[PDB]
Amino acid sequence: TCPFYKKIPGTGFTVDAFQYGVVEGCTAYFLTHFHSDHYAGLSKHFTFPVYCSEITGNLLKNKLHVQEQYIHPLPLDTECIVNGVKVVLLDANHCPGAVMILFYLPNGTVILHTGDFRADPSMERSLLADQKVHMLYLDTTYCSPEYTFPSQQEVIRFAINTAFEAVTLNPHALVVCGTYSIGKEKVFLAIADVLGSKVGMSQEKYKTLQCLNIPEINSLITTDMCSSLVHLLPMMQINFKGLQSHLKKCGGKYNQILAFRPTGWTHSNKFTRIADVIPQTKGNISIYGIPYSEHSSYLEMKRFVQWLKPQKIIPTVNVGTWKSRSTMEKYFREWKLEAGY
């Protein structure tokens, strides 16, 4: 059964609700972004209209084999009419093709569904600025003050300098970057760019990246591993065993691995500055965990919500425990009282 925070009242619409079969009364299914917890249940047998961004559409077609006739891509920042209801898709500053959805209900209510997002002050000069929002469906992934992490820019700076330094000292070192979905591409692209290399990867990953409308992508990635000194591997293989094994495969082209595991937050963020991050090392293998987030920090989420001043907030993450729910409602009330809405 579809939970309440996936239904848009006063419409035939659901958001990210493909794992409950045919939802009763649903005339259109919205998909905010191509991450598995959100698309769970789509496949080539799906026969209802799916509304999403162009990039999400490319992935639905090519990776999941959803038939073209059911894929409805919409442009961003544009007022569109879907089954008699005005909607707008906004950039969510999450992974490629991730959107927030604005719904203008026939009765005058305005709903913002953030999908997954990393709130940013630039959102304060989208089409959001123009009108009032009554309900916010909020990505509350890191809705607690302990969740701090740096900007994406500072993390990338750290990784670029780390990689460049290592390979300049040892021209026979290999850089590996872990991945398990789309998003966080800037980590491996930025490192490859500073080293003058393409990024080597499996055919399945290369296929995925070709769906993302990244400019000049054919100049950045390749399936020829041996020509490349930045390799992508599944996140699961980013460990001493997996990387030892991978080093065997390159045929003594390389005598050192420097690997990056982008995580979201880890508790090493309560104590350590990004500048101060050190790897775990075993022999000629080093693994850095770097806190590259595509979700809002606590501070970024609070600022967005205080700016938006919604009338009601419905969290879409961490909703399964009474303790989490209660914690989140407390922070919403503080935020409201502090800003005076």
Q: Which of 116, 139, 185, 300 binds Ni ion (CB under 5 A)?
A: 116
Complex with Ni ion: residue 183 or 200, whichever CB lies closer: 183
Complex with Ni ion: residue 95 or 111, whichever CB lies closer: 95
Segment contacting Ni ion (CB under 5 A): 17-25, 32-40, 78-86, 189-197?
32-40
Q: Which of these, 220, 260, 262, lies nearest to 95 by C-alpha position?
A: 262
At its nearest, how many Å lie between Ni ion and the CB of residue 155?
Answer: 18
Residues 260/235, Cβ–Cβ less than 8 Å: no
Secondary structure of residue 259 in the 3-state scheme = strand
At its nearest, how many Å lie between Ni ion and the CB of residue 35?
Answer: 4
User: Does 16 help bind Ni ion (rule: CB under 5 A)?
Assistant: no
At its nearest, how many Å lie between Ni ion and the CB of residue 92?
Answer: 9
Length of the chain: 341
Residues contacting residue 197 through CB under 8 Å, at least 6 positions apart: 228, 229, 230
Chain centroid to Cα 37, Å, comes to: 12
Complex with Ni ion: residue 57 or 242, whichever CB lies closer: 57
Residues contacting residue 323 through CB under 8 Å, at least 6 positions apart: none
User: Does 113 help bind Ni ion (rule: CB under 5 A)?
Assistant: no
At its nearest, how many Å lie between Ni ion and the CB of residue 95?
Answer: 6
Secondary structure of residue 56 in the 3-state scheme = helix
- Alpha-carbon distance 206 to 200, whole Å? 9
Complex with Ni ion: residue 35 or 302, whichever CB lies closer: 35
User: Does 185 help bind Ni ion (rule: CB under 5 A)?
Assistant: no
Segment contacting Ni ion (CB under 5 A): 116-124, 239-247, 277-285, 323-331?
116-124
Residues contacting residue 157 through CB under 8 Å, at least 6 positions apart: none
78, two tokens: 């544009």
Complex with Ni ion: residue 120 or 193, whichever CB lies closer: 120
Complex with Ni ion: residue 147 or 254, whichever CB lies closer: 147
Q: Which of 35, 198, 231, 302 binds Ni ion (CB under 5 A)?
A: 35
Q: Which of these, 270, 320, 275, lies nearest to 297 by C-alpha position?
A: 270
- Alpha-carbon distance 95 to 126, whole Å? 18
At its nearest, how many Å lie between Ni ion and the CB of residue 115?
Answer: 7
Site size with Ni ion, rule: CB under 5 A: 2
Secondary structure of residue 59 in the 3-state scheme = helix
- Alpha-carbon distance 54 to 97, whole Å? 7
Complex with Ni ion: residue 116 or 185, whichever CB lies closer: 116
Site string for Ni ion, 228-247 (x = CB under 5 A): --------------------
Which residues lie near Ni ion (CB under 5 A)? 35, 116
